[PDB]
Amino acid sequence: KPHVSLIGLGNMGLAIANCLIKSGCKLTVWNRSASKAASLVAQGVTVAATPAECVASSPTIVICLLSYDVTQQTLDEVIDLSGKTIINLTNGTPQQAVKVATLVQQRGAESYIHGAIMVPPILLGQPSSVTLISGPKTAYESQKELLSSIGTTRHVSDDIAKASLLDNALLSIMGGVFEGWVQALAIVGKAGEDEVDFAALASPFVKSMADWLPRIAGHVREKQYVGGSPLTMQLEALENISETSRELGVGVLLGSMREVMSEAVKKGKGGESIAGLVPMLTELDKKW
Amino acid sequence: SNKPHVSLIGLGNMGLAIANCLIKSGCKLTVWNRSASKAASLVAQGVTVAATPAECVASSPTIVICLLSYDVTQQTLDEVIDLSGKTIINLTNGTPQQAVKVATLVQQRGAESYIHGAIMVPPILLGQPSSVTLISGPKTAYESQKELLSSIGTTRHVSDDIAKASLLDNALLSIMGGVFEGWVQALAIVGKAGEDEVDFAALASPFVKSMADWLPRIAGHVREKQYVGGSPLTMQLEALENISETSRELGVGVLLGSMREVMSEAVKKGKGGESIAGLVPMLTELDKKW
Numbered sequence A: 001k002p003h004v005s006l007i008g009l010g011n012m013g014l015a016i017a018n019c020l021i022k023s024g025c026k027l028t029v030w031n032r033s034a035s036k037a038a039s040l041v042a043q044g045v046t047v048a049a050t051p052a053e054c055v056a057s058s059p060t061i062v063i064c065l066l067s068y069d070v071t072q073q074t075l076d077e078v079i080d081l082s083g084k085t086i087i088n089l090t091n092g093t094p095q096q097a098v099k100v101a102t103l104v105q106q107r108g109a110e111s112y113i114h115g116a117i118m119v120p121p122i123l124l125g126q127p128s129s130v131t132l133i134s135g136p137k138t139a140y141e142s143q144k145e146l147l148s149s150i151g152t153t154r155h156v157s158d159d160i161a162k163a164s165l166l167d168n169a170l171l172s173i174m175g176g177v178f179e180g181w182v183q184a185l186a187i188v189g190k191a192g193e194d195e196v197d198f199a200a201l202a203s204p205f206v207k208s209m210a211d212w213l214p215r216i217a218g219h220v221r222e223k224q225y226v227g228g229s230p231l232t233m234q235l236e237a238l239e240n241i242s243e244t245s246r247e248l249g250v251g252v253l254l255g256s257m258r259e260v261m262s263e264a265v266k267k268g269k270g271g272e273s274i275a276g277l278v279p280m281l282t283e284l285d286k287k288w
Numbered sequence B: 001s002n003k004p005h006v007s008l009i010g011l012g013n014m015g016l017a018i019a020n021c022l023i024k025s026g027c028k029l030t031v032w033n034r035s036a037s038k039a040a041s042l043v044a045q046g047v048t049v050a051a052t053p054a055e056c057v058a059s060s061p062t063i064v065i066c067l068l069s070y071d072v073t074q075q076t077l078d079e080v081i082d083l084s085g086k087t088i089i090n091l092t093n094g095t096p097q098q099a100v101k102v103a104t105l106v107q108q109r110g111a112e113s114y115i116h117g118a119i120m121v122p123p124i125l126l127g128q129p130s131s132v133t134l135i136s137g138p139k140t141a142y143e144s145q146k147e148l149l150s151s152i153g154t155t156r157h158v159s160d161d162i163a164k165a166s167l168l169d170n171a172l173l174s175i176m177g178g179v180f181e182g183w184v185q186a187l188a189i190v191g192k193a194g195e196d197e198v199d200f201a202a203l204a205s206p207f208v209k210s211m212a213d214w215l216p217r218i219a220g221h222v223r224e225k226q227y228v229g230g231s232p233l234t235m236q237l238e239a240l241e242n243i244s245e246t247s248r249e250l251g252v253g254v255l256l257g258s259m260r261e262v263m264s265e266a267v268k269k270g271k272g273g274e275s276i277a278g279l280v281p282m283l284t285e286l287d288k289k290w
């Protein structure tokens, strides 16, 4: 039984706690709301009064909090991380990973690795589970056996910030897929159709879209914006989604997409493909 | 003689793809386009170019329309006053009510029948059996046009209701607009960070097919009004905010504004603990641009 500490017992933190218990370690936990540890006490888990007491109990510290800001608040009075390895599974930006790595190095930590869990809690540890890890290969290799408790890990880079970079890119795709899906189900539901029958009809079409993504990535890399689906036509179809929604009394998402396509047309990029939109983003810090 | 007579109105990206599919399947084609020069590649293959929309419709018993919009369709059919003995196949993207408006316009003018279709692939994939076109309108009219329409791929008759193909088109294109908004954001981030877009597409591929798998479960939750799970909107909104900050760190713009705005309002209305299924009632109960 290796000693492990866990900071954070939210939806994901409790899923992590159960995986670590199942795999046979001596777990110490801390959470702002100590009552979230109730389901772990029967399984032989120690609840530490403070973040400092939690970190003192183990050589390996797992963190799964809401955000970077909560992480820095929680680590404020954790003064001695000498001989400790930090595994940070908290979502944030590439620079926020560098900021926590620096905070823990300043306090004597042996090593920092960052992970992005890419499944909901119920899939953690199951065969469908993937976690992206970044940081020094020797530190990943040191932790690989512990980390197997939460499912498959993918070492994506020795650069501490890269798991968060890739996390933020993949969650952009997830955000967009869910924005389109919520809009779709709102339309079909208000129109009196069955959402589950709609999902069956849709799923072929959605897997076809996923097959197009690598061709689009190649066009973006190669700056090849010519094809058979110009932004003028795409924008006309997005405008018809708004009017379909208005006709039904349903609200309208995809506003940022309409605004960036509208400006692309004004810049004379109306004849380009969807690849044409990437340069609209890469050259200007703006919320569309 | 042998080959069926077919008229096509519109020779844009998709209209030209249709023209080539109809030629290849062995039909006798008459075309009209605002820009007559778009027919140059069809004239060798033996197609007739009509001077006006009316003369085009006069040449054939079956009329295919593939124009930009309803507004352009209405304008283009302004002087098409006689549709007696003509079946109308409208493949122009528009709203459910615009499909009803065109069906009524062509009835008034004596059309035999009207079906609406939504092509769900780019022009280069038209004619592949795997390319699906959704068709709505009278079953008998669809069944009589099924052999002609097999030129452009596999057709799926979704409803006798003329407006249904456009309803389902607008819903499927909502998903495509979302997917592409997220994909453009993702490629802007990884590109500006100096990563390879093509290796990122490969890394991403598993993760995106996993999401398609989650959609029927979410649809069930929305139908059953089950909004409780392990991925609360407060946590999802924090992650979306970190996409904005990641982008700002790279000097890159940010999309997904409507998604941040509707999740913020959910959190404000006490639905911060709910799953993504909890957003659907935010849309269904209020006409609003987020």
Ligand SMILES: NC(=O)c1ccc[n+]([C@@H]2O[C@H](COP(=O)([O-])OP(=O)(O)OC[C@H]3O[C@@H](n4cnc5c(N)ncnc54)[C@H](OP(=O)(O)O)[C@@H]3O)[C@@H](O)[C@H]2O)c1
Binding pocket: A008, A009, A010, A011, A012, A013, A031, A032, A033, A036, A064, A065, A066, A067, A070, A073, A074, A089, A090, A091, A092, A117, A118, A119, A120, A121, B230, B231, B232, B234, B235, B239
């Ligand atoms: N849930 C998922 O589906 C999912 C999937 C992939 C990744 N993740 C990532 O996992 C991380 C944790 O998310 P979660 O789903 O566990 O979120 P959650 O259920 O909302 O839990 C958030 C955690 O942060 C703590 N926290 C929030 N504000 C705090 C504060 N001001 N001070 C101290 N602690 C505070 C909470 O403590 P209390 O219990 O006291 O509120 C809880 O431990 C996030 O970075 C998220 O992006 C989640």
Ligand SMILES: NC(=O)c1ccc[n+]([C@@H]2O[C@H](COP(=O)([O-])OP(=O)(O)OC[C@H]3O[C@@H](n4cnc5c(N)ncnc54)[C@H](OP(=O)(O)O)[C@@H]3O)[C@@H](O)[C@H]2O)c1
Binding pocket: A228, A229, A230, A232, A233, A237, B010, B011, B012, B013, B014, B015, B033, B034, B035, B038, B066, B067, B068, B069, B072, B075, B076, B091, B092, B093, B094, B119, B120, B121, B122, B123
């Ligand atoms: N990937 C795709 O291209 C795709 C996929 C699925 C469905 N669709 C649907 O197919 C339809 C046709 O799109 P497309 O790709 O062919 O677009 P496109 O290449 O922009 O062509 C638009 C067509 O409409 C004509 N047009 C535009 N404004 C006009 C006006 N004011 N008066 C008369 N004609 C006018 C154009 O004539 P000119 O040639 O003279 O400009 C052209 O024939 C759309 O409803 C679209 O949503 C397209």
Ligand SMILES: C[C@@H]1CCN(Cc2ccccc2)CC1=O
Binding pocket: A117, A118, A119, A120, A171, A174, A175, A178, B231, B235, B236, B237, B239, B240
């Ligand atoms: C697959 C899981 C499911 C919850 N996701 C939370 C989330 C964050 C941002 C946008 C949508 C969903 C993180 C994941 O990667």
Ligand SMILES: C[C@@H]1CCN(Cc2ccccc2)CC1=O
Binding pocket: A212, A215, A216, A227, A229, A234, A273, A274, A275, B121, B122, B124, B125
């Ligand atoms: C709207 C987007 C623009 C890029 N297209 C890429 C593509 C995919 C398959 C075949 C050709 C082009 C897919 C689309 O329809």
Ligand SMILES: C[C@@H]1CCN(Cc2ccccc2)CC1=O
Binding pocket: A229, A233, A234, A235, A237, A238, B119, B120, B121, B122, B173, B174, B176, B177, B180
């Ligand atoms: C794949 C093709 C590309 C043009 N599409 C129009 C469109 C509309 C909204 C958002 C993106 C693309 C329809 C399609 O099925």
Ligand SMILES: C[C@@H]1CCN(Cc2ccccc2)CC1=O
Binding pocket: A119, A120, A122, A123, B214, B217, B218, B229, B231, B236, B275, B276, B277
């Ligand atoms: C962020 C969204 C919220 C609904 N989730 C549905 C889901 C998918 C698989 C297993 C459980 C729940 C997927 C997500 O992660």
